[PDB]
Structure formats: structure tokens, C-alpha cells
Design an enzyme around this catalytic site. Structure first.
Site, PDB file in Angstrom:
ATOM      1  NE  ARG A 100      -4.181  -2.301   1.368  1.00 19.21           N
ATOM      2  CZ  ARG A 100      -4.027  -3.045   2.162  1.00 19.21           C
ATOM      3  NH1 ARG A 100      -2.842  -2.715   3.981  1.00 19.21           N
ATOM      4  NH2 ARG A 100      -4.664  -4.441   2.497  1.00 19.21           N
ATOM      5  CG  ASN A 132     -10.289   5.686  -3.102  1.00 20.47           C
ATOM      6  OD1 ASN A 132     -10.655   6.475  -2.230  1.00 20.47           O
ATOM      7  ND2 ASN A 132     -11.155   4.940  -3.903  1.00 20.47           N
ATOM      8  CG  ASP A 160     -18.532   4.666   0.706  1.00 22.40           C
ATOM      9  OD1 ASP A 160     -18.702   4.045  -0.785  1.00 22.40           O
ATOM     10  OD2 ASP A 160     -17.582   4.939   0.846  1.00 22.40           O
ATOM     11  NE  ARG A 163     -20.612   2.253  -2.779  1.00 21.11           N
ATOM     12  CZ  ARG A 163     -21.056   3.374  -3.786  1.00 21.11           C
ATOM     13  NH1 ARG A 163     -20.981   3.686  -4.651  1.00 21.11           N
ATOM     14  NH2 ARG A 163     -19.196   3.464  -3.692  1.00 21.11           N
ATOM     15  CG  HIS A 187     -13.369   6.598   1.384  1.00 16.13           C
ATOM     16  ND1 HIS A 187     -12.835   6.259  -0.212  1.00 16.13           N
ATOM     17  CD2 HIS A 187     -14.840   5.908   0.705  1.00 16.13           C
ATOM     18  CE1 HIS A 187     -13.000   5.726  -1.167  1.00 16.13           C
ATOM     19  NE2 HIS A 187     -14.364   5.275  -0.814  1.00 16.13           N
TER      20      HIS A 187
END
Lengths: 326, 326, 326, 326
Positions: A100, A132, A160, A163, A187
């Protein structure tokens, strides 16, 4: 010529130029979905696009120019960043076995080229970071840009939360806008679904179902949240990309800024000193948005175990950040 | 459960169900651009999608469902055509070294599967054919569907006329809607740019430039037309597809139908008996559109050499058609 | 003639006719504000007007016909009620030293003429009652019309809840849509501002100010509510009428119905058996609205003293109702 | 307080303030119809009102503030003109046995108070003059304001051209936007309906009916024009005012300016040196409108007897103007 026979210019001084100019950096499906949603809704008087892939760019921009009849915005697009000049908003969408850390550093290398050219032609623009990861990346854009905290915004948990409201509407058979619910923090996997604020018409749902979100819950409200975060993964594991919902959530964010609505959106922003957050990191909390940018933040009354989740994320976020070359 | 504690149904009889239902057949970029433009503009109370590629479909439809908060339409999508039931409009977008004959026959094989299932669940729907070639294919859909002439429409030269008005607006520095110009006939290479109708505010342009469109023209207005028709080729030779302009032109066509505006659009339709056209073929001429479908056609006063071009195309079109297995 | 030379009708069968037809009964400023808001927002394919004052009507309707260029709705208006035929929604706005009983009876005499003619040409229409008083009058329309409970709706506390959210937004410097708050019960002086549901982004305000609404409150939130209800009086005591806010709140209600959004609005409806209400009366509670009409009601968790206020109003309302000639 | 517990301001510098601010001078029915149409269409981020009748003003503005939930504009209104500060557009609607000279002088006295205060707080605003007579009055505003020709616009024949297209649409059964026709010159009785530009889809109507507009015409197209100009009189001779169509035509004009569409509208403007016009007067001709104001004029190819009508009006207009105290 014909133009001359037909038209005589009766204005002595130079045109004032565009005033609601928005630029979308990046012409992947997320940029185009942001761009077409912005155009379809009449939100600005000029939409500019920009990306290093010159041919792909010119094809997107030529295509949208061809619909100018059904629209109300001037459309430009170029590889050189002087095309983005005088934007009010700049929506950044450019993006990425591997760590990452390192996937982040590459995205940060990308930002190192982009941001300076944006700042150069739009010194007073508001940045809305969308790629992202968004929390760290809004941060990067912020120190890597020099702008005051309020002109640097991350799209955070906007989609989100949207959603989440949509899924809650399907369970209840209510339109999404009548179901109110908030997801905050970092997030993705570690976001916080604030069960105490989930209501229809001010009626607390957790009030009717005290176990909402816990292992004692007879209706697995927790799985709804997990569904929201597994969202992008499930769609991409199906059509090989994600775009539509994000693009609509971007235009929603942009409309609030350009019309100066002082509307409340869960977006990513500097949270140091909120809810026990020590480190300089960005997370989503309810924020006021207008044409000045992000003017105010809302302090939700979070239970201790929810402030804790936000602190742990900031540490994980600040873990990565301290490793970055900026 | 929570839903029950919160909501009590107070309607005895069954819901009346959707009333502005539109279905988009096909989830390539043309379908999605049609679908997202239709949704962004609030044109219908339900949008259904359908395609043989089930996974791709479910990813598109899941993605658009996720933005239901910023929208006002119910969204469905399935491989089975009972999902398209009770549509008012069905926009058909499914598509294709090799011969035109044979490329046509394949597209016609595709229509043979699709049309019957559409007719089955939407007996009173209006068909709007969009896939290329559109003139012959609207024809195919029409006899291959049984519908009365007025419920079968081809998108014809709508976008090209739009694109033509956009290009004329850029040359003149006028918004597209203030430049009026029409392209008719067979869509593509052989279309007719009607120079006598090209005007700004009722002022004939050909009036100011008598050579407009000819080899005596000192401004090459003919090249503008050629640019309009080379449009899809240039964009695809750039980003590897076309979608945006078409999708916007589809939603424009759909809005005129669903709101019953009796608006005039250049679309493909049965032209036998118009301008000396002998054969049963479809071409674009100005047509009145409402919620009944295509109610009226306009008779443009075309010069002899323009009626001739339309007759030659119909023969070329009818050349291919007589070879088809329907 | 010219029309004939220019246009040939190519549709054999009769047009299907309008499908989103709305009728506004009454051309006082409330009707016109309802009508112009409905038209400005593209909500229906036909808007009809009706009123006993024929000349006033024809001037309103002629005036709106004259803007048909900037609109998308067919506009009709006549004294005879066959002009209202086939409406989906019928918004009733016709209206009134003297006793409330008797002011009510006159308004009920008015409804006795109107309703039957509406039912006659729009047997399946949804009634949306707007004239004051609205709670009793929606009731009148309901028994005096024969329609099933779900097709008879009163506008109740929609605008007041809106006005309440607007006032709360000005105090907080937030757009109205980010401040959530509900007023229910009998519209006017005796309505219930539900303090427990007043939140920004799911954050309970009463949570931050426990005395909210009481005599122990250091910020007089109660006065905000009183301001909402003194609203119509203060405006009329200023410009001699009220219209704009109501008209916008009507179009909001109508959009939810015609697009079948299943959205939650505080509107007046049959509340017998809710919160201890014994009598057959109408009051505002959160209701689900779609194209079927009013499909669902929400049960707010009201404290005892709030259920009590609703019961007392129903008795006061049923006091008057039992005295009525229907 | 509650606000403080809930919200923390995170912006150091002063807000940039409204950027699409429009002011409507006058709260008669023409102002409100302009204002509500502007608001219903989301055209600006702030709408200001102003009028000498303070109470009437405060009631209008309070009423529109009460609908802020369904809107996206901040609404202000005051008698002091500092409330109009920083407008982009200022729509002037304030108005009037007796002589035309003298009815004009009074309207000009009114403008003498208003204009200076407008210029004082909005030095760079665009003026859009709407009150009748509009041709002379736009002129008055122009010299009486000091602004460059391009920032001073009269609404001229915009609505009448719209009304003309609407009436032509009803005769033909076509939506207004598909019927193209222009009325120019001095607004009212002496305006010029340019028959050569009347077309549907580029098809000249006069082409199909050579006598169109003359005494040899078998269909009395001239009476349609007369109907357009008798418009305001017939409506007022019916409901005692006019407003709706004008308000919609104002918002149409304003949208073109604020979104910088470079769209063509027939509006009043300086025509000296056009079509043989000698005198410094204003008349309607097709004009390009953007956010710079009125940038370009179109030269229609007018027949001699149509240039003559424009010259005669300018003399009649300049007759009155030379008599004015400015």
C-alpha cells in the site's frame, strides 16, 4: 466573408471570460462520469479537461463538444495546463502484487506533476480530490499545494453515505432522500456508520432497534454498511470499472460549491483536534460547502468507541504519510 | 422488524406502477451514455436495461443504482426481457474484412432475437432505433415488429444535425441553438446538408453566400458537412469509441416523446412517396414527435438535385434490403 | 393551405393523449403560484386550470399560454370541468366578524360544487387539498368524493416544515436541506414541532440543548415554531396575500407523486388509530408519496405529551366536523 | 449555544461572496414573475429585490425566503440600494387621459432616482430594461447611466417573438421551439414581423405562401402578428394585469447572460447606422448575449419596406426623446 456580412461586434472592451469554470483532471471513466454529470446538470459556464494521454483526451473532448446543442457549457480540453486557467473548481481524478505504501507513493508522484501546474493557472481554485486513497491524497494535495485548509477538499464518504442511504431506501421502500444516515472517518473498510443518526423523518431507527449494528441485531444492519464499502469492488468485479455513482456524487459536491449553498456533505478534510485526533490527517465529517470552499465542520456527538475508530485510522493514515516523499 | 414498527401500508389496492418507463437495450458505451443522459435529466419514472452480457449488465445497473440519491428514477436491469415490461420507449442500441451486406445481416440476426421479446412485454411501446446502420435497421425493426409506422423511429440524422449546428456555431461564435441547419436523407456519407435552410435568426446564410456548399464557394461550407459525417470516425480514431454526443441526442429525442412536445426532429422514418422516393425505405426528414410517437412529417422544399440524392440512397438502401433474411 | 403543403399526418390511430395531466382548481394567487411552479419545473405534460371567475381564468391561462416557448407543458383552462378530464393530480385551492364553524361551512359549500365535477372527469385522479383549513377540508373532499383513503391528500404541514427548516438554516448558516425538522398534527396554531427529530447530519440538536422548546431554554427554539405558524399572517399583513412558498411546496408535493418517488412528506391524511387518535379526522404525519398516491404512513415515536396534543386537536377538529352539512 | 457546540468555522479569510447575483428592481407582478422564474430555474446564487414600497417589498421577499428549501438561491430585499450591491444583472421593471410625452417623462423621472443608486453599488452590472415603453427607456438608462453600449439592454421584442412562435405553433400543431419567426423594430404596434425568416426546419413558409402578411394572403398571417401585439392588452382586459409570459422571457434572457451562452435574442439596443437608421435610438434586432453583456448584433437582410418601417419608428422615437429632461 459570411460571418462579417451577418454579424457586427459592438463591444469595445475584452470579454470578462468564464466565471463558473470547472476543470476535471483525468479522462478515465471517473473523469468522464464527473464531466458528463456536471454538463447534464448545467453547473458551470466552462468545463475543461486535462490528462497526459493526449489522444484519449482529444477524443473525449471532441465527443462532448459534439453535443454542445443540448448543453450550456463551453467545453475545452488539452494536455497543456494553460487550458485549465481560471477554474473555480478542480476535480482531481488521476490514479494508479504490491505494498500500500508504494501504491501510495506512485499516486503521490502523479500528484507532484499535476498539482503545481494547477496552482499555476488557478491560484485561487478549490481542489476537490477524488482519486483513491482519498484521505491521504487530499492531504498530499493540501501541503503539496500551499492552499488554505478550506480550499482543499476530499470527496471522502460522500458517495458511500449516498449508497448507504440508497440501500436503506430499498430495504424500507422509501426514496433515498427520505432516509438519512451518515458514514464518516477513513473511507473504505474502516469507515464509521453512525447508527444513532440513522432516521426517517427524524425518527431514530436505532431507537426502534437498539441492537442496530451489533452482534445482537436481529436484522444485520452491519451488513448494509459492509455492502456500501464492498461497493466499488463488487461493481468492478462485474463490468471491470466504476464510474457512474461517483460522477453523480462529484457533480452533487460541485453544485453545492458553485451555487454557494452552504450545504452539508460528509467530505474529507483536516480533522486534527476533532474527536481526540492528534495527528495531521484528513477524514470525512459533515462539512459546510459553498463558493468559498469548505467553510465549517460539524461536530457529531460520537460515542467513545466511534471516536476511537477515528483515532486508530488517523494513526494508520499517519503511519503511511510519514513514510511519504512529498 | 424495524420497517414494520416504522411504516404502515395504508393502500388497499395494487400500485399503478411506472408510467414513463424507458428501456435501453444494450450496455455498450452508447447504451450507458443514453441511460445516464436520460437519468440526469429526469425524463422517466423507471429506466430498464437489457443485454445478453449478463455480468456487464449487472455491473452497469448496480453502479447506477448506487447513485439513486441524486436521481429520480427507479433503475432495473436484467437479461430476461420481462424486466423491460410496460416501457413507453425502447431505445435499441445493440450492434456489430467483410461486406456491408453481411455486416448488415449479422446486425439483423441480432434484431431477430431482440425485437420479439420487446414486443412481447411492451406491445404498445415506441421503438427508437439507434444502432448503425440506422436507416435500414429501423426498417428491419418495423416489419420485424408489426408496429404501425408511427411507433417505429430511427435516430437518423438527429445528432449529425446537432453536430452540424455546433460546428456552425463555432465558426460564427454563436451558441448552437441559434444556428439552424438541417441534414437529411441516408445517415452517413450520403446525407444531404440543406443549404437553403441554414440561417441565423431567419437570415438565410446561402442568401449571403450564394455559392455555399459548391465548388465556387470561397469558404468551403461543404467541408463542414464532411466534418459532421467524419465525426464518429475521427473520435473513435482517438479514444477508441463514440458515446457522449449520441447519448445526449437520444435523451433529447426521448424527452420530446415522453413529454408529448410535438417537437420537430430530423429522424429516420418511412419516406415512400416523399420527394420521388419509390421504394419502401427509411430516411431522415423533419418529423413531429410526441407521446403517440412520430405523428407528422415535414415536406421540405428540396431542389431537384437534393431529391435525386434521396432517391439514389433509397435504391442503395433497397439494394441491401432485398437481399436480407428477415 | 400552408400547413398542408408543409405537413402530412402519418398516424392512423387516435393520439394517446396527455399522461401527466395536472389540474389546478382556482386562479387566485395560490393557484397561479402552484401552476407557475409546476410549469417551471417540467413536472407534467398538461396543466389545466379551472375557476368560476371565467374572465380572470381566461386572462391567467392566456398569459401562461403566451410563454409556451420556455416551457414543456400544454396549457388549458376553462370554466367547464370537461377541461380537467383525465388529470393524474387535482390540486384544489379554492377558498373563503364570523364563526369558524360557519367560515368552514361556506368553504364546504364550495367543495360541494367542485368535487363532484372533478370526480366526474377524473375518476382515478389523486386529490391534493390545499385550501384552509386543510385538515378538515381534506376530510370533506375525501368522504364527499368517495375515493379510497390513498387518493385523498392534504398539504398539511409541508410548507411549515419547509419554513421551519429554512428558519433553522438561517440561525445556523446552513442550507435548508441540511437542517432536518418536522412539524406535525393540526396545521396552524396547534401544530407539533418534534424537537427530538431536529438534527443536522443525524446530530440531535435537542441532544446538545436538552431544554429545546421548553421554558427552560436559553435560546427560545419555541419562538421559531411560533414564527413558522405566524408565517402566513405576517406576509399578508405586509403585501396583502400569500402565494410563493405555498406554490413551491405544492410543486414539490406534485413532483413526488408524478415521478413516483416514494418520498416522505409531512402531509394531512387519515390518522384514526395513530397515537391514540380515536376520531375519524385528518392530520399531518410523515407520509410516503408516489404515483399511486399516499401509500404509507410513518409512525414517529412521539412522547406522551405530543400524542396528547394530537388527540386534543382531533377532538377540536371532530367538534367542527360533526356540525357540518356534507 | 447550540450553533457553537455543533459547528466550528475553519475558514480564516473572508468569504468570496455571491457571484451570479441578480437584482430585480420593482415588486409589481412583473418583478415577482421575473423573480420567481429566475429562482425556479436555478440561474443565480443570489436574488435581490428593491422597490420604494417598503411593506409590499418585505412581504414578497419574506414569502420567497419561506420557500428556500426548494431553491438554491439566497434571497434578499430592501429599500436601500446597498442590498443590490455586486449584482451581475439588474432587471429594471419599475413603471407608470394623458400624453405619451408626459407618460414617458414620468417613467423617466422614475429612472432618474433608480439608475444612479444601481450604478453606485453595481458599477460593472449589466442593465436589462424591461418597463414600457422599453425602446426609449433602455436609451434613457444608457445615457443616464454612463455604461458602455454593451452593458445596457432592452427586452425589446423577446416575448413578442416568443408569443409569435407560440401562436404559429398552435396553428401548425408544432411545439413553439420548432417554429422560427422574428419580430423586430419598435416594440408594440409598429413592430416588424419578418415574413421571409418564418420557417419550420429551414423550410420557408412565405416560400409556400408568397402572399404571407399581405392583403393578397388567403390565410391572414398578418392578423397573427396583430394578435401578438394586442397580447398585453387582451390579457389585462381580462385579469387586470400581465406578468407570466414576461417573467419567463426575462429569465430566458438572464440565463443566456449568466451562463455566457452567446445565444441570439431579439432585444432592444443601439441601432444607429443599421438599416438606414440615422438617429441615436434603440430597437430590437437579433443580438448575441453572454456574460459580457450584448456582444454582437445580427444584420438581417431586410427588404426596403422593412428598413423603412424601422427608420420611421426611430424618428417617432427620437421625436419623443428630444423632448425629454434627462
Amino acid at each position: 466573408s459570411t460571418k462579417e456580412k451577418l454579424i457586427s461586434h459592438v463591444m469595445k472592451e475584452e470579454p470578462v471570460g468564464s466565471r463558473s469554470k470547472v476543470t476535471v483532471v483525468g479522462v478515465g471513466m471517473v473523469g468522464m462520469a464527473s464531466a458528463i454529470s456536471i454538463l447534464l446538470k448545467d453547473l458551470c459556464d466552462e468545463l475543461a479537461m486535462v490528462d497526459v494521454m493526449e489522444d484519449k483526451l482529444k477524443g473525449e473532448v471532441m465527443d462532448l463538444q459534439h453535443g454542445s446543442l443540448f448543453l450550456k457549457t463551453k467545453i475545452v480540453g488539452d494536455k497543456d495546463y494553460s487550458v485549465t486557467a481560471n477554474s473555480k473548481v478542480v476535480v482531481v481524478t488521476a490514479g494508479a502484487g504490491e505494498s500500500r505504501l508504494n501504491l501510495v507513493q506512485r499516486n503521490v508522484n502523479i500528484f507532484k506533476f499535476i498539482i503545481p501546474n494547477i496552482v499555476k493557472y488557478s491560484p485561487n481554485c478549490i481542489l476537490m480530490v477524488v482519486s483513491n486513497p482519498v484521505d491521504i491524497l487530499t492531504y498530499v494535495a493540501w501541503k503539496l499545494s500551499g492552499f488554505p485548509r478550506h480550499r482543499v477538499i476530499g470527496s471522502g464518504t460522500n458517495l458511500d453515505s449516498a449508497r448507504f442511504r440508497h440501500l436503506i431506501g430499498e430495504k424500507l421502500h422509501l426514496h433515498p432522500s427520505s432516509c438519512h444516515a451518515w458514514i464518516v472517518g477513513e473511507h473504505g473498510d474502516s469507515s464509521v456508520p453512525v447508527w444513532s443518526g440513522v432516521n426517517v423523518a427524524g425518527v431514530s431507527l436505532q431507537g426502534l432497534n437498539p441492537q442496530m449494528g451489533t452482534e445482537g441485531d436481529g436484522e444485520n444492519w452491519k451488513a448494509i454498511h459492509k455492502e456500501v464499502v464492498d461497493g466499488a469492488y463488487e461493481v468492478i468485479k462485474l463490468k471491470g470499472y466504476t464510474s457512474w455513482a461517483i460522477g453523480m456524487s462529484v457533480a452533487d459536491l460541485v453544485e453545492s460549491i458553485i451555487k454557494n449553498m452552504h450545504k452539508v456533505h460528509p467530505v474529507s478534510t483536516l480533522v486534527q483536534g476533532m474527536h481526540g485526533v492528534k495527528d495531521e490527517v484528513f477524514l470525512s465529517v459533515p462539512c459546510v460547502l459553498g463558493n468559498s470552499g469548505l467553510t465549517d465542520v460539524i461536530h457529531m456527538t460520537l460515542k467513545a468507541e466511534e471516536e476511537k475508530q477515528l483515532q486508530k485510522s488517523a494513526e494508520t493514515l499517519w503511519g503511511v504519510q510519514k513514510e511519504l516523499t512529498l
